[PDB]
Design a protein around this ligand. Sequence first.
Ligand code: 4Q2
Lengths: 240, 1000
Amino acid sequence: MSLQDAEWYWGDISREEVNEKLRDTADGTFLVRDASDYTLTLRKGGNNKLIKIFGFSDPLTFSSVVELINHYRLLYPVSKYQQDQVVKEDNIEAVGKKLHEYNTQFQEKSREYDRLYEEYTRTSQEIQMKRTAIEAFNETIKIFEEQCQTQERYSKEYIEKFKREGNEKEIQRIMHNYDKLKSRISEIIDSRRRLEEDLKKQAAEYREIDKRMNSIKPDLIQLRKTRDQYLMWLTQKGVR
Amino acid sequence: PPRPSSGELWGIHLMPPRILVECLLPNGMIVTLECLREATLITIKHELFKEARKYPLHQLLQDESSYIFVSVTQEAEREEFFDETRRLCDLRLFQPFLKVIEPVGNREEKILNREIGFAIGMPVCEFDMVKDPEVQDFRRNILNVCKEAVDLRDLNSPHSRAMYVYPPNVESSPELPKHIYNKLDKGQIIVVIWVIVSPNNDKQKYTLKINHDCVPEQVIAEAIRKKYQGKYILKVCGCDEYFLEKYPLSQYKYIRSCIMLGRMPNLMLMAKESLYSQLPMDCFTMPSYSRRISTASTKSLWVINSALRIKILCATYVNVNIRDIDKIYVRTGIYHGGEPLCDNVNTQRVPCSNPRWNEWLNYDIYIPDLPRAARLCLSICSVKGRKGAKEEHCPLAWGNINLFDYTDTLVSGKMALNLWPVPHGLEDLLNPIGVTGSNPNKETPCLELEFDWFSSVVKFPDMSVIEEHAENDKEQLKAISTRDPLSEITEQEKDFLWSHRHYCVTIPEILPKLLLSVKWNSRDEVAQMYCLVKDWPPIKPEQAMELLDCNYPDPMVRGFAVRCLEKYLTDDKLSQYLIQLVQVLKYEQYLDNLLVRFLLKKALTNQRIGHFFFWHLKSEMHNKTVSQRFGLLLESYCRACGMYLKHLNRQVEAMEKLINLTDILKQEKKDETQKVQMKFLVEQMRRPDFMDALQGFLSPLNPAHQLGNLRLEECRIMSSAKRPLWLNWENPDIMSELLFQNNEIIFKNGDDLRQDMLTLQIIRIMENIWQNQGLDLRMLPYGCLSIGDCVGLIEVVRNSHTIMQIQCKGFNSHTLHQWLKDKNKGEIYDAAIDLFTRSCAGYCVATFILGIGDRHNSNIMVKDDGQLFHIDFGHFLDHKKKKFGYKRERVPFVLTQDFLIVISKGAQECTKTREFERFQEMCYKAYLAIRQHANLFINLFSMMLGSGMPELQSFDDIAYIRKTLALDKTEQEALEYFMKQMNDAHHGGWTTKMDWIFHT
Ligand SMILES: C[C@@H]1CCN(C(=O)Nc2nc3c(s2)-c2nc(C(C)(C)C)ncc2CC3)[C@@H]1C(N)=O
């Protein structure tokens, strides 16, 4: 019953175009297209099965290609219709005007995604640098604290002895160095504190870039698919 | 962690001439010492110990000789400075401080581990930490391969040692293509044997006419005759390439190139002993981690009578804008390769703000039917149902898990998994081609999971158990086996191949077609498949490689593939395909596998393989998806490579100085004139720490090339916005004038060079197909090496200019032909035009097939002798499909009138010429020669899908070469297609001989 007017027949479309259509579909989703005789593609167990139409295995009872599909109807068809619902416009001029609009919107949105993706990468790299730097401050601070401990373990006996010899200049020399050591540790700790601050801010700046990107990604895919739909409409309407 | 920058300090690229250093004395004292940025540790220690006498408790200090310095490096490592000859600027200090300690521990192990850590860009101690038993077992277990290689290197010392250092740079076969052989005079070659006579080192010349078939000893024999005992060896003049193995002279690549180019082969005779003496005996030592302690009711998978079930508990968070997205869910899939073993199951949708599911997902798979290489691929997706009844689904983070571990244990209990960012351009909801395992960054979305418990530890069945025995078609099978790897295979052909699985052994090359006809979700079919591969005949290495891509995850299949390489893959081809062999390692389910062991064994028995093996892995150490795998592998290479570690560390230090220098120009000096930047380059390059690091090391582009002293007057920052450095070095070889005096290299920090590296690899493979098929289409696959994240080296081609450079300094359509005339006057004119036409054809065909970026006057260069070549490939395949949605195959290299005029020697009607007729025939022959080797190119591209190259992410991206090569058409139809593409692009001119039968 009827032929090329059939919703599931798609003609010259490639395996790749069918893979795009059958992507994430339910078992029984199918469509027929020209080979390289025609090829029925059937969605089953998360895969697209390619079944050659010679009748599958011989002899036949093929009648016409439509009788074969309708015999097994191979649940849901991928209709030519509703894809052609996307382009409302009547004439070639209204469609070309709309293709130019969408294509211009797509190129802007693409350049915005690219710019946003570069800032995502840079922020992600920078965050990793600061994390290594805080680990380096952590190891540095530990060494300077060990110096305090080591100075404390030694001087304890020497300062105690230096008082017996009335040498106030030597005790003041020792504790002047301990002041130098403590001030330095406070300078290193403060420098780590500030790096910890920048990282908290840049980690928040990363969440927001990720958020912004999860918003444009679906809108860029949809806009490209419309640009492409108007492009396909304009090829078929125009001279071949 | 890995070093944030290549600076002398944290947040400081270059230390000032003088710098204050905080010195932490062993008595608790702190001394500020003003040091020179290039001062050595011996000087600093001596100055500190002199100054320390002016501070309290000096009496507690021992001799300066009793101590060494330790400090925190940019890798957050506490490094002990045993090499006191090192300079303060080269220590990679986090902050300017030094702590004085007494040397403790195993000094030699510590020195070796630091040298390893330096080469690899990560401290060795980071591995010691790692909890994962798979990791620690890999570290210990790989040591078998290390031992094997080193023992096998001291087998026939010093020849086996010389064979490792300087391996024969030979072709895969002695069979000389008939067009190469006709350049010979009665199957004989004229060679020039140079000798460095003692004591004045005078260069003596000896021209010899000998059989091309002559083994290196026979060449020595003839040189002796022209005044018995093989006490001499041959070497190439101007580089470190030796003829140490008994291969016919013509089989050696250098010689094979000399014939074809009509070049005079210049060799050097030297004493076997003067080379053997200069070779140090390499000594591997068993590391600490091999000499230490660790490790402080079982069911078969086939006895588990239950379906597959996985519980998706909750996710910590997601980064989504709640005003733009409606709900979030967990998409999951059970995969064998990139093929689901059953339908993909989703959890219920929940709100963005509360990622919690506590849902068991039931899979249409019977637990015993799970194949060995089965994986759980998952993702957290967003769903926005704004317009019509239409909903946009976007992945947010993905993760993959091996359902069985390295010990064959089925996964059980509660599992937490840190998810990975979605790779740029990936629109699929799952990433089954991505790596397995948790993200090492713990500040990412973490997904809590829970697998079934079967009151016991479930193990995959033993191989003994799996061995359960429970005419018109002969021509159809051959037809299926000739088809390309990505050809459509119907369910009918599957069922047919599966039924004929036993006759399939007569055509072994059908194994990939048969393996894809197997139901991997059936222990019945797989058990049988396993018995077939066990007793399967071997296949060619170029066919076996397909079985190592993401389509073949099975360990028996991959095991079979590795054995074909072990027995049939020549070192020439391993070197040629190493890029792909390193990439497929990312597809490996586990750290310990037959592939990694084979490649390491080879890298450790051939230094030419070892060099590039190291660089391919070192270049990707910034990438957290593979840095643990690549790190552990590089540690085991560095531990057993011998003296090559020292030369690798000199290459690595030279490169860090170049990265830092270019980083300064790109960041700090960014808003400064060329003169100001050039003044800074000039003064920096003059520094001794810089001169020591960038002089006297091996070229990472070709380790047989010695980079001697820099010719600073020839070094410069290029006008391009990335600010590439043009660098020149003297070739320090005694006979450099016979090869090249100037070794010029472009250092680029900014652009990703991996696509150029691949395009240049393919061009070389194409050029080789053509030579072997009797076509002299001279290509220029210039050296290009990625050394890190968007950083690499490019080989400068001398006496070559862009078309725009030629067009300026002289313009009309004859300017190019006039330029070639001026550079090739008289007798040498014809050869210039022949070379242009031949090169021009190879580039025309190659670029049409690969779909390289559009050519213009700036990315097409011509050598003074006419040899045309392309530079800056950048893009390839269908790079314009997403951007403009046009369904076409572009002709990147449209031969302008300017090129036509050259080919036609300045004629009026350029296409009606015999010159253009011959040029067409070259193109047609080249196109069909690649189309016949289509399977190779498809495999090579398939083996790069996990690379992270933007334009190579799916098998649908490879479809482009299936179109340009017209694989779903007949050879005659494909040539008609090529001709039409040329005609449509050039607006006519392309013709042939006969239509119906296509016979002259
Ligand atoms: C006057 C001298 C003669 C030689 N020469 C060159 O420039 N030779 C070169 N050989 C190559 C170059 S440049 C190259 N460049 C680039 C970039 C896109 C990064 C610039 N990518 C790739 C390659 C590879 C080959 C000078 C000249 N022509 O001005």
